[PDB]
Symmetry: C3
Subunit: 341 residues, 3 copies
């Protein structure tokens, strides 16, 4: 009656993650600086459940996962539900890869976040931007997604379509599709992705977004590695207005024995609308990080970063368009731990 690994039909896994983060804002209001700024803890720990199952009457193996959200993030209250993060059912087969239904990363977002948002570059490059509509969804419910196998060990595809944010609550007809591709060439990976979003309702208009990206990731054999990524966002509104905005992120790393130094910079350039650039609509961030490989399953890290955000713009409804800079410019010093089980 002695249990083995096979007696279970699930596994519990987790990312235990804690960032002690001190921010210093310069919004231009002293009180707002005190509120937003200060030390907080950013407990991004999470628990999840997942499993496989070989159904007796269907060859492609059944797969599932249910992942909790961040338990106690900064700027937020305690407590997370099961299902807030990647949460899906699906099927896998050697010859065609896998397909997932539910809550997953869009193919684009996955590349935007990794490598291109790390470390701390996300306020600018992840959710930062001044463009109307929806540049791309991130983690998204009501999504079906195909991950191809690595054809010839060189090549692979990520493809997805899904429902919008309003559609997932029966409050609109918004939807999107997108695709991404990955090519291994010697020590390089070349990445490309697209995502289109349709029927996005915003600022008294219906929008269509088209967002494209390419990037490279390289590994020298002496512990040096890097990435750069370029990202081009267009949006078109039901009243005729066009908007274009681009952006870039780059990172440099040196990994030597148990240590990794990392330098990262990312920026959105000025937004254009109907071909007139809008002044001071750009943002950037520089970030420096030292990381220690404290165990095969864990890391300690220290990090400083400096965000200069855009200094405001109006959306097409004659009202301030919220952006990742509405709360103001800020610097941040942080130390942290992450453990994987």
């Amino acid at each position: 009656e002695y249990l083995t690994k096979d007696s279970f039909s699930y596994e519990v896994y987790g990312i235990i993650a804690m960032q002690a983060a001190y921010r210093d804002y310069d919004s231009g209001d002293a009180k707002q600086d005190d509120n937003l700024g200060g030390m907080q803890l950013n407990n991004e720990s999470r628990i999840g459940f997942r499993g496989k199952k070989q159904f007796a009457n269907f060859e492609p193996t059944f797969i599932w996962q249910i992942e909790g959200g961040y338990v106690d993030p900064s700027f937020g209250g305690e407590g997370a539900g099961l299902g807030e993060r990647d949460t899906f059912v699906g099927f896998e087969s050697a010859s065609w890869g896998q397909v997932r239904l539910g809550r997953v990363l869009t193919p684009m977002y996955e590349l935007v976040d990794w490598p291109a948002s790390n470390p701390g570059l996300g306020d600018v490059y992840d959710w930062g931007g001044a463009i109307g509509g929806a540049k791309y969804q991130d983690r998204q419910s009501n999504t079906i997604r195909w991950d191809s196998p690595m054809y010839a060990d060189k090549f692979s595809i990520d493809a997805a379509v899904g429902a919008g944010d309003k559609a997932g609550l029966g409050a609109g007809d918004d939807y999107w599709g997108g695709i991404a591709a990955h090519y291994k060439l010697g020590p390089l990976q070349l990445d490309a992705a697209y995502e289109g979003n349709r029927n996005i309702e915003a600022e008294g208009q219906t929008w269509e977004n088209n967002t494209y990206l390419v990037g490279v990731q390289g590994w020298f054999e002496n512990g040096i590695s890097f990435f750069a990524q370029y990202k081009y966002m267009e949006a078109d509104a039901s009243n005729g207005v066009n908007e274009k905005q681009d952006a870039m992120s780059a990172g440099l790393m040196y990994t030597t024995g148990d240590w990794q130094y990392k330098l990262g910079y990312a920026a959105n350039f000025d937004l254009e609308r109907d071909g007139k650039t809008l002044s001071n609509t750009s943002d950037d961030v520089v970030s420096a990080q030292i990381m220690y490989f404290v165990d095969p399953s864990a890391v300690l890290y220290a990090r400083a970063r400096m965000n200069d955000f855009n200094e405001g713009l109006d959306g097409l409804d004659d009202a301030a368009r919220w952006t990742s800079g509405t709360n103001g410019d800020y610097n941040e010093y942080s130390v942290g731990v992450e453990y994987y089980f």
Copy 2:
């Protein structure tokens, strides 16, 4: 120190469940049709915890469970708490069955939902209806419930009382009791249930509800089986008003090797108030379903159904009474998977 099944004092269990569902509404408003309609995913997966414990100083075995809600249902946001579904402590004894305290199905609801709400018949027969007050609570917190053993293998009783919805938040004195009974007669099961609800506050009045039901479930030995159920709902308001409404649900199945075809229809008939029937207060649904028994622990299914809801009524406060048809008539095509561990 090699673990056995007995080293644990809990078990993790789960229903992994995904429905890809396309709806097509005919509310009479085009925009409302686009919003509510379209494809969505209905991730009704859930995780739970449960255990038994033989207390050294008390014979009747201790039992408990804590079950999470649906992680990412359709028409809803992601994330569910532990405790949203059946969540209780209790005791069990061979000679008197079991008793549970906490969050359970009312004895009536359990019969309303199974067999009588499946497949897709619930908008009409589960929460559908035009009657005032509370026809019956469904899953309900603050409930004690006795499940009798199967006396003589033929016969058994389900009995419960509990607090109301307002009472569970110290905002009223609402409560209910009810009871259900089950008799095996050859290849049949005969069911009966009652539920009374008292001090229900609604539409500027205090209500009392009394709801009765009977049904049959039958198994031919050639893979043919069926159910029918009749349900009679009365409500009385503190100002004198009487209301009566009845309803019926029936289902037909043919289960042959690894397949099951299913036909289901259910309807609420026109509501009566103070003995005047009100025109067009009825609803119905027809539903067709093919199901494959893809593994002992899983099923795939395809399903189409058509809901015609009532076309509106006023409650006793001179204001639209919300019903399962306020959002409008709709059809639905669906395919799905459910796995049990």
Copy 3:
């Protein structure tokens, strides 16, 4: 491949806890008495996850925990998130004890709650009180806390600082520190604790709180034991106003074979502001309890208690200051079960 306790990197633990509680309010409004009063179930069950990990490159052992909240308490809806209760990362070392970052009890609160809030004394002694500002935070996110070893088996320290409630959402600059100390002297424990809270915003003012306490806990060898605790709370407001209020809690127990009888009383005395006592700002509670040790891992209990709260006061903004008595005086009869795994 036969699992042992060591094959896991986590353990699931739980407190399964159910209280059937009848309250009888005397607010002075009959309807309010019916709402708040009545029978309810108080499911304070909770699940948690925790583990240890010896990192290969860092001596002090890594520790973590993630604990869910109460699944279905009384006066509340069903469902709790992971992380609502003690939820942290940390490190431990034989020579310096342990340090935790995240969501923990303040050193004071831990003593306020145990022994001094039990049984049922918390409406008075835990969150009860009329004093402005924040007397002390309780379970608190954004906290670092050091627990010393038991130096010389006699002596130990609990020390902590953390961010405020507004600060944990970037809506203010509120913070606190405090400390507590524990001395074993024959059959006694002597306790002392402090907590200071700063930049608390309330009633149109900024406050500073200082709260001090001492107590004793004693064990006779015949199953008799007791506690008493005194607690002195001061608060100072940005406009000059001073406020002082003190309080005491005591409990008596007799534990004989499988049984424990318990008597507890606690009270807040009248509040003083700028040296004028305010009439009828005090509260008390007496509570009686019989508890049976139904298993090494479980208890049954019955309990009756009587709360007489203060009869109202204004805060410095000329508006009722909410207190644990705003809802009115009430008595409560309760029976309950608690199981530990």
